[PDB]
Amino acid sequence: VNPTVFFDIAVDGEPLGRVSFELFADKVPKTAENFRALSTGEKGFGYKGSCFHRIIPGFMCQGGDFTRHNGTGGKSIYGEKFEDENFILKHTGPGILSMANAGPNTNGSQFFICTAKTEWLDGKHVVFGKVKEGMNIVEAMERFGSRNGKTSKKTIADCGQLE
């Protein structure tokens, strides 16, 4: 069965709620495994304690830069940025979980959660999961964003894999 991972989100250190995701390991196993392992921290690094540095209401929440906290860092579990695995899945609406990148074949650890349909990203960003529980928490997060993406308050307080 496809894995499920959770993030416990905090705003300025205060608990907000939990978001869980189904990872589409049946369709993008390499990309799903990267996100899964970064969520459990089992390789010795990952998402716990990192922030969502760019949140644009009506578009997306972006995070996963656990090394520089601003969109310039992050790394995959593969010792280098990795390839676009496939583009089977499309950006169909809110809740889609997709990889951030800076060009072809440059996936690291950064990802975004869509809060709208973003079809112009189809074929350019690898979709690999979707929000299962807590879309309402993603909507709460979105309120702390702004047009230029800066957040009005600061995190993934805990994360891991659910049965």
Angle of CA points 65, 27, 137, to nearest 5° = 45
CA separation for the pair 39, 55 (Å, rounded): 20
36 carries an active-site annotation = no
Which of 53, 54, 89, 144 is catalytic? The answer is 54
CA separation for the pair 75, 106 (Å, rounded): 10
DSSP secondary structure code for residue 120 in this structure = G
140 Cβ neighbours under 8 A, 6+ residues apart:
16, 17
Which of 7, 66, 125, 128 is catalytic? The answer is 125
59 carries an active-site annotation = yes
Which of 16, 38, 97, 121 is catalytic? The answer is 121
Count of other CB atoms within 10 angstroms of residue 63 = 26
- Header resolution in angstroms: 1.4
Residue pair 69/50 in contact by the 8 Å Cβ criterion? yes
Which of 62, 107, 110, 111 is catalytic? The answer is 62
- Say yes or no: domain 1-163 is CATH 2.60.260.20: no
66 carries an active-site annotation = no
Give the method used.
X-ray
CA separation for the pair 21, 135 (Å, rounded): 10
18 carries an active-site annotation = no
CA separation for the pair 132, 145 (Å, rounded): 22
111 carries an active-site annotation = no
DSSP 76-88: -TTSS-B------
CA separation for the pair 1, 14 (Å, rounded): 33
CA separation for the pair 161, 6 (Å, rounded): 6
CA separation for the pair 44, 14 (Å, rounded): 25
Exposure b/e, 85-112, CB count within 10 A at least 16 = b: beeebebeebbbbbbbbeeeebbbbbbb
62 carries an active-site annotation = yes
121 carries an active-site annotation = yes
Q: Where are the domains of the chain?
A: 1-163
Count of other CB atoms within 10 angstroms of residue 120 = 9
Tokens 């996100």 correspond to 35
